[PDB]
Amino acid sequence: GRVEVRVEFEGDKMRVRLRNDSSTPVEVHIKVGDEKRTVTVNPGEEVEVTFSANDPHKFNRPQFTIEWKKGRVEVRVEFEGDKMRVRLRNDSSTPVEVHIKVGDEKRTVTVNPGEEVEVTFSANDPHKFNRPQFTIEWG
Ligand SMILES: [Tb+3]
Ligand SMILES: [Tb+3]
Ligand SMILES: [Tb+3]
């Protein structure tokens, strides 16, 4: 299994592309401020989710929840100063590799059931954090 989540912050828009390269349908929840969007991604399927905000600063702390039907992986991104914090919580019965890609930086962490992992990324240039992407891998 693999669920690919790509984010682009092109403008007043957060685009999220979700690919389910696994054999079970996943439900994906995204929260940014007052707006929550929710989508089923069937096996093989790609879905685009787009938030708008006049003030693009309201996209500071987006949360992603992948549900398999229990089984949830929660991913919170906190853009604070020159740093991007990524907090991964695994609430399933099985470990998950999370591969993270922010500009040049590539980073892989295992997350066992009931573990929370925080990875911090640095930027010389806050435009490094404009197209962050993460993949959750299971079995
Ligand atoms: Tb684009
Ligand atoms: Tb539902
Ligand atoms: Tb469920």
Numbering used by the authors: 1 to 69, 83 to 152
Show sentences the authors wrote:
Here, we devise geometrical principles for de novo designing single-chain immunoglobulin dimers, as a tunable two-domain architecture that optimizes biophysical properties through more favorable dimer interfaces. Here, we devise principles for de novo designing single-chain Ig dimers with interfaces diverging from Fvs, as a two-domain Ig architecture that is hard to find in nature and optimizes folding stability. We envisioned that de novo single-chain Ig dimers could be designed through two-layer edge-to-edge dimeric interfaces, resulting in extended Ig β-sandwiches. Key to such robustness is the two-layer edge-to-edge strand pairing at the interface between Ig domains, which involves a high number of backbone-backbone hydrogen bonds and protects oligomerization-prone β-sheet edges from solvent; overall favoring monomeric stability and solubility.
We computationally grafted an EF-hand calcium-binding motif (DKDGDGYISAAE; PDB 1NKF35) in the β-hairpin bridge of scIg12 (loop connecting both domains) by designing N- and C-terminal linkers (short and structured) to integrate the motif into the scaffold. Among the three most rigid designs identified by MD, we selected scIg12 + EF3a (loop sequence KDDKDGDGYISAAEK) for experimental characterization as it was the design with AlphaFold2 predictions of highest confidence (pLDDT > 90 for the five models and across all residue positions) and most similar to the design (Cα-RMSD < 1 Å). We also noted by MD that the structural rigidity of the binding motif increased in the presence of calcium and that the interactions of the four EF-hand binding residues (D71, D75, and E82 through their acidic sidechain and Y77 through the backbone oxygen atom) remained nearly constant throughout the simulation. We ordered a synthetic gene encoding for the design, and was found to be well-expressed in E. coli, soluble, and monomeric by SEC-MALS. Terbium-binding titrations were monitored at 544 nm with scIg12 + EF3a at 10 μM final concentration, and showed a hyperbolic increase in luminescence that was fitted to a 1:1 binding model, which gave an estimated Kd of 5.1 μM. Calcium was found to compete with terbium for the same binding site, but with much lower affinity (Kd = 1.3 mM)—this is expected given the lower charge density of calcium compared to terbium and hence weaker electrostatic interactions with the EF-hand motif. Lastly, we succeeded in solving the crystal structure of scIg12 + EF3a in a complex with terbium at 2.8 Å resolution by molecular replacement using the design model. The structure of the scaffold was found nearly identical to the design model (Cα-RMSD of 1.2 Å) and the parent scIg12 crystal structure (Cα-RMSD of 0.7 Å), which underscores the robustness of the extended β-sandwich scaffold to a 15-residue loop insertion.
